[PDB]
Every structure is written in structure tokens, then in C-alpha cells.
Amino acid sequence: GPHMLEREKIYQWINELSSPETRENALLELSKKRESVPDLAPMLWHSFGTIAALLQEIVNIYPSINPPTLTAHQSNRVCNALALLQCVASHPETRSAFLAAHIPLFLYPFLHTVSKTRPFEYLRLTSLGVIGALVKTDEQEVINFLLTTEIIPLCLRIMESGSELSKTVATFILQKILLDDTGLAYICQTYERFSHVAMILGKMVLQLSKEPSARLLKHVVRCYLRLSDNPRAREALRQCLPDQLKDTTFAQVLKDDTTTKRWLAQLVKNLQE
């Protein structure tokens, strides 16, 4: 009964995504029912022009990136489409075809920004959240995609700069790539790829001793641990590991983080020889 009117309200909204006159309302009304309705992602993909419309919404704000003129209305509007794209990227029925069209390649311009304005931070996080959604599926295709697209160089920039939240989510994305064996082998293949990552991680340690973050310290340690699992990487880390990880610098902060204490403990034991 009432559900049939609700289903038709969504059906019309999806149809209303096409025309630019009716997109804004349908972008709003559908970004609210994203978790409410299950089959939104297959319907969004297989309907006409709908995925193209969201891609337009993304490119339409590219002029506001450089020079940075991103308004709050622009940011909320384009993120509501990013929310719908996350629904497509989450649903298993559409995830692979979503990656097949290389759709996340168009959020990478947002990860290059540095503006720190609330409209840019909302864009930065919502774009990071889409990637964090893909890495949580732990699918082989996800790891194989992100490595080839050079998202790792994009993260490392956000891990050095940016907010603490942005730093955490970026490290989590890097972390999840390292957790996969293929992600590790890729990063430890060349020296330019290792050293760029390790120096990032070292500069983050010094920043954490002056600007502490509990969750950041946790995922930074986990990244160092995963690198220690690689033979040539473990060697380079015995001379490279920040001394602040070895000493008493982070002792007070980690006094109540059991999981992080154990990871750090294993890390020093892993490099032991």
C-alpha cells in the first residue's frame, strides 16, 4: 500500500535525475533513502543517463577547484551525488561494473585539494569515504584497481597535510591496501615507492608527538607493522623506524590502547635480529 507510493516516488526521482531542472530535488530526496531502499544501486546504474548525471555533477564543480571557489551549496549538492555513487559502489550487483567504468577516477581531483574550507573538507571526506567503502569490501578487484590508478600518491599527500580526520581515513585506506598481500608487494617492489611511503610515515610520527591523535597513531603503527612483514622492507625499517616509536614518547597516550600497544610491540619484535 503506502510502500507502493514510496516505490513510485523513488522511481520518479530517479527519472528526474536526468533533466538539470529536476536533479537538485531528486539528488536530495534520494540521498536520504540511500540506506532505506536496498536496490537503489542497480536501479541507478541500469536506468538511463542516471550515472551520467552524477558524473556531470562531479565535473560541474571542477572549475571551483582551481582557483578554489567552492561554495557550501556546491559542496552539499555534489556530495549528495557522491553519496548516491557510494551506494552504487557499495552494492555488490553494481560494484564491478562501477569500477569497470573507472568512476572513482573522477573523485581523485577532489583528493588533490588542500583548501581546508568546510566545503572543501566535506568534499574531501565524502570522496575519501567512497574509497574507504571500496577498501572495506576486501575484494581483489578493489585492491588491483587502486594500485594502478595511483591513489597511494594521493593519500600520502593527505596524510602529511590536511586534517586529523582526513589523515586517519587516508591512512586507513593505505592500511587496507597494505593488509592485502598484493598491495604490499606493489609498494616494496621499487625503492622510490617504499621510501616515499616510509618518509611519509616518519614525518607523521614527528607530527603526532607534537599534535597527538589516538586513532591516527593506531593506524600509523599498523601500517609500519604490515611493512615489517616484507623482507626487504623489514631491513630498511630497522634503520628508518622513528626513534619516537622506540622510546617513551607515545607511552602516556597509548597507556589504555591495548590493540595498539600489541601492534607496536610486535613491530619492534619483527625487526629484532
Binding site: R118, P119, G129, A133, L165, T168, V169, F172, R215
Partner: peptide
């Protein structure tokens, strides 16, 4: 933007853990 910014922050907090 405020509401959406906040709820997005809570969401990212769960995700990384």
C-alpha cells in the same frame, strides 16, 4: 552543510575501526 558534515564524521569514525 553542518548536519551533513557532522553525520559524515561519525560515519568515518566507525569505518576506520
Amino acid at each position: 552543510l553542518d548536519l551533513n558534515f557532522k553525520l559524515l564524521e561519525e560515519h568515518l569514525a566507525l569505518l576506520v575501526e
